[PDB]
Design a protein around this ligand. Structure first.
Ligand code: CLA
Ligand code: CLA
Ligand code: CLA
Ligand code: CLA
Ligand code: CLA
Ligand code: CLA
Ligand code: CLA
Ligand code: CLA
Ligand code: LHG
Ligand code: PQN
Ligand code: SF4
Ligand code: SF4
Ligand code: SF4
Lengths: 62, 139, 738, 42, 80, 31, 29, 135
């Protein structure tokens, strides 16, 4: 999961469940437990389109 | 304890009631380098003094709505007390001397769940049990 | 720190007036009380059904006691068409002389109430002839309500409380409720009809001192055991028999002529004694299906998990995974409650749809108001019982469902596509309102602009085919019991339609309500009824299926059933809960039954007044619904008290206006919301503390009542004002212009 | 007529039972029903 | 006496603490964020229930909840 | 022929039997 | 996959719809 | 078959043509209603027979449902056109009318264009690419 890649979401509690998003940044510290920040093209509910995610709940599409 | 001169306020109606004499009563205490006028949380406008100020409010949301007003007058030294009717003045805001926005050490992760919010257990897991589904000691 | 409520200690330390009200609407929710196990749960369900059956038996003993004491059941039974029944008497000590005189009706010597319940017609049919059989039936139901208050006290004593293994005995309860509760008690009612009600409809008086000697048949007690069963239907009541006399009677007790008695326009009492005998044989047979301890029968736990169909490998019943549904239904008391209200709001609609068309009671067809007030009663009961069948579906999903045990079965598959059921209930709703409202206000504009002939009038030719497939020869489809040369008419291999020549005399007589004449004004209201049943399903299915959560809030289960909201974040989440979708569908239940019972009433108020061409020409547009039904028939109602006098409709003219007040006061709780009133009670509580000579003081602080409470307080007044207004228009526009 | 009479048996009985259960007894009943609603636990 | 739980989807942006009108939340140190902080609620007896911390959380399906429970005299905002 | 004057008073004392037994049930259910 | 059980129950209900529509257009008697 | 007599020999419809005004609304549209089935009150009903009103009921189906799926297919093929241009947030407010007309004349033959996407499997989106809730 590198920066700029398109990825799909497997978090069932989220707004963008099974939505394609562009990865914005991945943290290299290794102790933050939600490193990958993926940016989506639709806002959730009066607000953000970026959200921190884990790597086990993300399936890339290309 | 607490001390200070009250601001020039000509009396109001949204002030203390019989709850403040019988149950609890709050007191904010700041100091001002100016003879400026501020808006009361009990409706109106009052002139704060130049020494130690002292204002008795009825509930804690009135003090921090006032405390959020003094922070726009560049006064960030206010102490909020809670005065039980037997005279016991506890000191509640800011508790450690440091404002709760910026982090200090020695403070505890209190009321913290070590799971995602979406993986709380179902309410049929906790059926006829004392705990709620957001207490849930598994993860 | 008060004692009340004793069931929940998080509410007893409430310092406000929310403690009183939230202890009323939580007192029967036994599953959320503090310190309750599952075994103690069921033993308070069980012992409060006993205290509820005693309310039913004390209510039915107040019907009987008040027409034995204050009614005219001895007077009414001699001319049951030209005299009105008496409910009870009036003692309102503030009447004037114009209301003593106006309410002294039906040959009374005191002010009285005309009974619009129809219990006089019920007791005339089942064989009650004097005011003493009503009195000793009222004293028996008092004592029968005492053995159910005693049984409820018995089954809370620790030597008599059943255990959880007895309450979860689902197969042994289904055996005795079919064979004993439904089979024996329908066998016993055919025992009353054969022994008492049929001979008392033929003149002879059969009582408790009489029934053991005179047999109900001259071939009695012997033609059953040999096999000469045709003896019981030999000579029936002929077509000149008049009710409760011997002149024209027969001796058959179990015969199946079908159709109506020619004098009472009711079903034959021999036809109903035969009916509950055939119900009882079929139900006692059906009670021997599941296994108790005698090793034969069906195990419902095996029928769920059976995956073998004569060597094949199907997934279950109907190739569908039903595994794990036995312990889903049996542990959930809300799955069992929602299935029992759905099956009781169908039997309450089926009561209403049949008792007007096939009247079972003597001369109840010729009592136009008790016939009208009993349709509207059982359709509003059936709309409430169906909103509650989906209210407990939503409580089942939240409180009593787990996805791990119901893994892969038929209950997970519904949630797997629940946005395709709500997307299709919202298409049928959107279809049936764009073309039912749009087809009225096309017909409204055409009649308004002169050209009534340019109306779009769809003849409902699919439900005109149903009547022509049952015997109505008016239209002329000429098929399948309208064609007497057919296979269904003759039943060619046996020719045993002994019910058929009596039925076709009933469906083709134009004086009964059996399969009324259906025209284009009836096409249109059935699509309002279909629009009504689809939107109020849409609100209730979306309330049940989104009770776990959706994208606006994915933790609805953690917040309970009835919570206000989740704040103004994420746009705002007013009415988001599954309680607040079992709530918007009470406005649609009451609306739809204000379209059902507005169309039952106007179709029947045009038949009873003879003006059948009034409904058939002016129900196709919405002005005639407003001019010819609402504005026209309320003429005799609002004149219940003019400045010049006062008649017997002066209480229905008052309840009609009491119900506009209760409807309008509901809007205060529905339009104005809670923080308008909390800043106003904060002001009236200032003026109480700062005034002299006011020595009271609130024990618990006055707050504006909560968010999900005023939705209920404002739905109670909406409902009561819906029922006090229509239950005073339907009563007073029928009991004045008959 | 100008008066509330009763042709039924024991016609004196609504004369006392209607004032009893409607404006004489309920204010005692609303007192007893208020003394356990606002009763304190210790 | 409400219940303000805090889940590990936090990012330490301190926005719920600045939005609380009653000082229920405060920032404690942590290891799972770049700010090294997480909110905690030690003064949950002062929770007025108003869910203004919930409108300020920028994590999707937010990392802080207020579970409205047994309301008391300081959890209902009564000055009388 | 309505009921007698005594039959009303007979009904009032018979209905004290489910009036007292309704009190035994309402308090054993522990209000 | 070829739906074998979803069909022959949908076209079995469509078959019962076509016997009723055979009597409706007075085709069969 | 039913009692819906035609309006030619219906004895209650000829009075609607007997005393009537003229202008444009009750003369030529009233003699065109004469071949319509009408009941016992002289109002032209809409019945469903086998063959006498087979195509007489199928013209309001086929004329409407073509230009029901002509509005819908030009609105679907416009929203799919502006999402491959990666500017769909701003092209939905400011309608690009050279493309919306180009996606309108592609929807004039939409019944032979929908079934080219049904057998190609491109009409529906597959269930693992559609946003849902916690279910
Ligand atoms: C033959 C034995 C028998 C009988 C007569 C009963 C009778 C009763 N039981 Mg019991 N039960 C039994 C055995 C029996 N039970 C056994 C062995 C168990 C152990 C598992 C139980 C466990 C049990 C529990 C836990 C409860 C009961 C309850 C009840 C009462 C139901 C309340 C009611 O009004 O019903 C209905 C009355 C009617 C007159 C039915 C008419 C209305 C129905 C809906 C319409 C019938 C029409 C028919 C269905 C239409 C379709 C017919 C079809 C052929 C087309 C009732 C009096 C409840 C109770 O306690 O109440 C006090 C309850 O809580 N029972
Ligand atoms: C508009 C719809 C409608 C209509 C026409 C009726 C008609 C009828 N109902 Mg009613 N009822 C309805 C809706 C309706 N109901 C609904 C939705 C409920 C559920 C709450 C009830 C519950 C109900 C009960 C409990 C009873 C009736 C009874 C009756 C019958 C006699 C009353 C009468 O003469 O007419 C008058 C006009 C009316 C609008 C009737 C109002 C009766 C109200 C609704 C009673 C409600 C009880 C109340 C909630 C508790 C009060 C307790 C305390 C304050 C005293 C009558 C046929 C009585 C009966 O069964 O006859 C023997 C009876 O015991 N109904
Ligand atoms: C001040 C207004 C007022 C009050 C306090 C009452 C009070 C009462 N009425 Mg009443 N009534 C009223 C106005 C009022 N009425 C008006 C304006 C009419 C039209 C003339 C009536 C016609 C009426 C009838 C027909 C009956 C009552 C009855 C009753 C009693 C039953 C209690 C109840 O149903 O609830 C109660 C004593 C009932 C009764 O006497 O109980 C046995 C009874 O059936 N009232
Ligand atoms: C559960 C309901 C029920 C009950 C308790 C009874 C009870 C009785 N029946 Mg009855 N019966 C019933 C249903 C019932 N029946 C039904 C459904 C039918 C229609 C087939 C009959 C048709 C019938 C006949 C023809 C006779 C009885 C007779 C009797 C009596 C038997 C005589 C005796 O001394 O012992 C007895 C009291 C006999 C009798 O002589 O009555 C005194 C008698 O001749 N019954
Ligand atoms: C067999 C029938 C049946 C049974 C046993 C239940 C049982 C239950 N229901 Mg329920 N329900 C039913 C039918 C039934 N329901 C129907 C028919 C509907 C549609 C209206 C509903 C809709 C419903 C909802 C929305 C809820 C329940 C809830 C509950 C649970 C608690 C009840 C409660 O709150 O305390 C006691 C209830 C009261 C003391 C009644 C409050 C006041 C009501 C509205 C009566 C008002 C009438 C009015 C005063 C009369 C007018 C007087 C005069 C002027 C005319 C309980 C297990 C609640 C729950 O499960 O919480 C998690 C819940 O939220 N039900
Ligand atoms: C969602 C749409 C919908 C719904 C819920 C109903 C519902 C109903 N219709 Mg109805 N109908 C519809 C569409 C619908 N209709 C359409 C588009 C027409 C042609 C104008 C009709 C013509 C019609 C007649 C002549 C009659 C009914 C009748 C009825 C009632 C009984 C069921 C029945 O036999 O007919 C259902 C017929 C269907 C064709 C089912 C609709 C299937 C889908 C939605 C069709 C798709 C649209 C299609 C492409 C155009 C029932 C409440 C009967 C009635 O009025 O009772 C008194 C009656 O005799 N309908
Ligand atoms: C539950 C059925 C029921 C109902 C709805 C009524 C209704 C009425 N009765 Mg009553 N009554 C009943 C049963 C009932 N009765 C029985 C079984 C008896 C025999 C003891 C009586 C004996 C009686 C007399 C002597 C009188 C009335 C009278 C009245 C009228 C005014 C109320 C009153 O002042 O008297 C008070 C009521 C009583 C003294 C007895 C009623 C208590 C019964 C036994 C049970 C009702 C409690 C009920 C189950 C509570 C549950 C509801 C609750 C959950 C909200 C009123 C119409 C008066 C009248 O005739 O008006 C003109 C009159 O004076 N009744
Ligand atoms: C061209 C754009 C377009 C297309 C192809 C669709 C297509 C569809 N919509 Mg729809 N819809 C649209 C725009 C569109 N919608 C707009 C702008 C709104 C807001 C008013 C809606 C609100 C809406 C609702 C509430 C529902 C649908 C539903 C549906 C589905 C079936 C029912 C139907 O015919 O539509 C219904 C059409 C309307 C209600 C009005 C839209 C038509 C006008 C003329 C706008 C056309 C846009 C124009 C070209 C620019 C269908 C796939 C139904 C569904 O849930 O699926 C089964 C459903 O209930 N839509
Ligand atoms: C008059 C009121 C009209 C109501 C409108 C209908 C609303 C619902 C419309 C679509 C419902 C879809 C649900 C069935 C679709 C569905 O659930 O498919 C899934 C189900 C299970 O399939 P399997 O698990 O066997 O696997 C699929 C393979 O079998 C493929 O062949 O297939 C069936 O059992 C057929 C269902 C027919 C059920 C009706 C027959 C009843 C028999 C009556 C005698
Ligand atoms: C009027 C009103 C109030 C104030 C309501 C009050 C103060 C009700 C109390 C009035 C008296 C005390 C009760 C009226 C008496 C009734 C005839 C019987 C009630 C007694 C119960 C035990 C049934 C709200 O708190 C509110 C909250 C949210 C939305 C709308 C509203 C709203 O409309
Ligand atoms: S307080 Fe009222 S308006 Fe505000 S979110 Fe809650 S329910 Fe909605
Ligand atoms: S709850 Fe909100 S403010 Fe607090 S740490 Fe999480 S994201 Fe930051
Ligand atoms: S409910 Fe209000 S006081 Fe409590 S944490 Fe949230 S914003 Fe702060």
């Amino acid at each position: 999961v590198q920066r700029g890649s398109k990825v799909r979401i497997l978090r069932p509690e989220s707004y963008w469940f099974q939505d394609v998003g562009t990865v914005a940044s991945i943290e290299q510290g290794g102790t933050s437990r939600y490193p990958v920040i993926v940016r989506f093209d639709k806002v959730n509910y009066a607000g953000v389109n970026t959200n921190n995610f884990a790597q086990d709940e993300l399936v890339e599409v290309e | 304890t607490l001390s200070g001169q009250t601001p020039i306020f000509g009396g109001s109606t949204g002030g203390l009631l019989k709850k403040a004499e019988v149950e609890e009563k709050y007191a904010i205490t700041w100091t001002s380098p100016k003879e400026q006028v501020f808006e009361m949380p009990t409706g109106g406008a009052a002139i704060m003094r130049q020494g130690q100020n002292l204002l008795y409010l009825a509930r804690k949301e009135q003090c921090i709505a006032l405390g959020g007003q003094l922070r726009k007058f560049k006064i960030t030294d206010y102490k909020i007390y809670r005065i039980y009717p037997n005279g016991e003045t506890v000191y509640i805001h800011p508790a450690d001397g440091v404002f709760p926005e910026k982090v200090n050490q020695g403070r505890e992760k209190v009321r913290y769940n070590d799971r995602r919010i979406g993986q709380n257990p179902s309410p049929s897991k906790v059926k006829f049990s004392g705990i709620a589904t957001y207490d849930a000691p598994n993860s | 720190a008060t004692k009340f409520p004793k069931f929940s200690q998080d509410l007893a330390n409430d310092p406000t007036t929310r403690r009183i009200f939230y202890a009323i609407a939580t007192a029967h929710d036994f599953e959320s009380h503090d310190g309750m196990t599952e075994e103690n749960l069921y033993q308070r369900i069980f012992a409060s059904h006993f205290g509820h059956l005693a309310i039913i038996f004390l209510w039915a003993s107040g019907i009987l006691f008040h027409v034995a004491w204050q009614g005219n059941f001895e007077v009414w039974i001699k001319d049951p068409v030209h005299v009105r029944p008496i409910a009870h008497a009036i003692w309102d000590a503030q009447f004037g002389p114009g209301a003593i005189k106006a309410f002294t009706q039906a040959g009374a010597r005191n002010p009285v109430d005309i009974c619009y319940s129809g219990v006089y017609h019920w007791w005339y049919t089942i064989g009650l002839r004097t005011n003493t059989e009503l009195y000793v039936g009222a004293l028996f139901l008092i004592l029968l309500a005492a053995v159910f208050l005693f049984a409820g006290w018995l089954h809370l004593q620790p030597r008599y409380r059943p255990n959880l293994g007895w309450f979860k005995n689902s197969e042994a309860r289904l055996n005795h409720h079919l064979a004993g509760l439904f089979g024996v008690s329908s066998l016993a009612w055919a025992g009353h009809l054969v022994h008492v009600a049929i001979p008392e409809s033929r003149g002879q008086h059969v009582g408790w001192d009489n029934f053991l000697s005179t047999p109900p048949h001259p071939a009695g007690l012997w033609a059953f055991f040999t096999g000469n069963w045709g003896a019981y239907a030999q000579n029936p009541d002929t077509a000149e028999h008049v009710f409760s006399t011997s002149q024209g009677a027969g001796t058959a007790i179990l015969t199946f002529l079908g159709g109506f008695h020619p004098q009472t326009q009711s079903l034959w009492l021999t036809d109903m004694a035969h009916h509950h005998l055939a119900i009882a044989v079929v139900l006692i047979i059906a009670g021997h299906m599941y296994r108790t301890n005698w090793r034969i029968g069906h195990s419902i736990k095996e029928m769920m998990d059976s995956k073998t169909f004569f060597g094949r490998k199907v997934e279950g019943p109907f190739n569908l995974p039903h595994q794990g549904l036995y312990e889903t239904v049996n542990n959930s008391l809300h799955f069992q409650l929602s299935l029992a209200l759905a099956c009781l709001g169908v039997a309450s609609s089926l009561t209403a749809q049949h008792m007007y068309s096939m009247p079972p009671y003597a001369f109840i067809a010729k009592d136009f108001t008790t016939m009208a007030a009993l349709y509207t009663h059982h359709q509003y009961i059936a709309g409430f019982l169906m909103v509650g069948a989906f209210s407990h579906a939503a409580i089942f999903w939240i409180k009593d469902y787990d996805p791990e045990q119901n893994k892969g079965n038929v209950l997970e598959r519904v949630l797997k596509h629940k946005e395709a059921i709500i997307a299709h209930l919202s298409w049928v709703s959107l279809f049936l309102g764009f073309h039912t409202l749009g087809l009225y206000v096309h017909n409204d504009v055409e009649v308004a602009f002169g050209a009534a002939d340019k109306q779009i009038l769809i003849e409902p030719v699919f439900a005109q085919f149903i009547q022509s497939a049952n015997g109505k020869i008016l239209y002329g489809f000429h098929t399948l019991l309208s064609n007497p040369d057919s296979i269904a008419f003759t039943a060619w291999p046996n020719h045993a339609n002994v019910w058929l020549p009596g039925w076709l005399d009933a469906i083709n007589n134009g004086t009964n309500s059996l399969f009324l004449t259906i025209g284009p004004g009836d096409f249109y209201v059935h699509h309002a009824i279909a629009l009504g049943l689809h939107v109020t399903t849409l609100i209730l299915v979306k309330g049940a299926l989104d009770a776990r959560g959706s994208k606006l809030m994915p933790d609805k289960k953690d917040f309970g059933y009835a919570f206000p909201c989740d704040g103004p974040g994420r746009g705002g989440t007013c009415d988001i809960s599954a309680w607040d979708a079992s709530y918007l569908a009470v406005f649609w239940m009451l609306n739809t039954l204000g379209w059902v019972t507005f169309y039952w009433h106007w179709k029947h108020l045009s038949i009873w007044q003879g003006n059948v061409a009034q409904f058939n020409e002016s129900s196709t547009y919405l002005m005639g619904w407003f001019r010819d039904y609402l504005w026209a028939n309320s003429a005799q109602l609002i004149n219940g008290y003019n400045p010049y006098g006062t008649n017997n409709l002066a209480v229905w003219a008052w309840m009609f206006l009491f119900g506009h007040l209760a409807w309008a006061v509901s809007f205060m709780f529905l339009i104005t919301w809670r923080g308008y009133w909390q800043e106003l009670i904060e002001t009236l509580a200032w003026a109480h503390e700062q005034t002299p000579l006011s020595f009271g003081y609130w024990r618990d602080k006055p707050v504006a009542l909560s968010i999900v409470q005023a939705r209920l307080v404002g739905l109670t007044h909406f409902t009561v004002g819906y029922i006090a207004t229509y239950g005073a228009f339907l009563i007073a526009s029928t009991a004045s212009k008959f | 007529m100008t008066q509330l009479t009763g042709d039924y048996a024991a016609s004196w009985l609504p004369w006392i039972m209607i004032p009893l259960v409607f404006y004489i007894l309920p204010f005692p009943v609303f007192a007893i029903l208020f003394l356990w609603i606002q009763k304190e636990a210790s | 006496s409400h219940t303000v739980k805090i889940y590990d989807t936090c990012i330490g942006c301190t926005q719920c603490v600045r939005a609380c009108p009653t000082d229920v939340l405060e920032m404690v140190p942590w290891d799972g964020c770049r700010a090294g902080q997480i909110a905690s609620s030690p003064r949950t007896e002062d929770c007025v229930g108003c869910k203004r911390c919930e409108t300020a959380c920028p994590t999707d399906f937010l990392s802080i909840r207020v579970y409205l429970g047994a309301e008391t005299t300081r959890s209902m905002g009564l000055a009388y | 022929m309505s009921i007698s004057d005594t039959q009303v008073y007979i009904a009032l004392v018979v209905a004290l039997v489910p009036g007292f037994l309704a009190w035994r049930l309402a308090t054993e259910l522990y209000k | 996959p070829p739906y074998t059980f979803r069909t022959a129950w949908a076209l079995l209900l469509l078959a019962i719809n076509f016997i009723v529509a055979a009597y409706y257009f007075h085709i069969i008697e | 078959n039913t009692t819906l007599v035609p309006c030619y020999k219906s004895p209650a419809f000829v009075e609607r043509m007997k005393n009537a005004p003229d202008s444009y609304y009750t003369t030529k549209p009233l003699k065109a209603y004469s071949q319509l089935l009408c009941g016992e009150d002289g109002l032209p009903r809409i019945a469903l027979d086998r063959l006498s009103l087979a195509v007489d009921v199928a013209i309001p189906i086929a004329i409407f449902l073509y230009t029901a799926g002509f509005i819908g297919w030009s609105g679907r093929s416009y929203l799919q056109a502006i999402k491959k241009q990666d500017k769909a947030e701003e092209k939905e407010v400011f309608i690009d009318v050279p493309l919306f007309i180009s996606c309108m004349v592609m929807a004039l033959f939409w019944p032979m264009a929908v079934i080219k996407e049904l057998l190609a499997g491109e009409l529906v989106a597959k269930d693992e690419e559609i946003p849902i809730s916690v279910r």
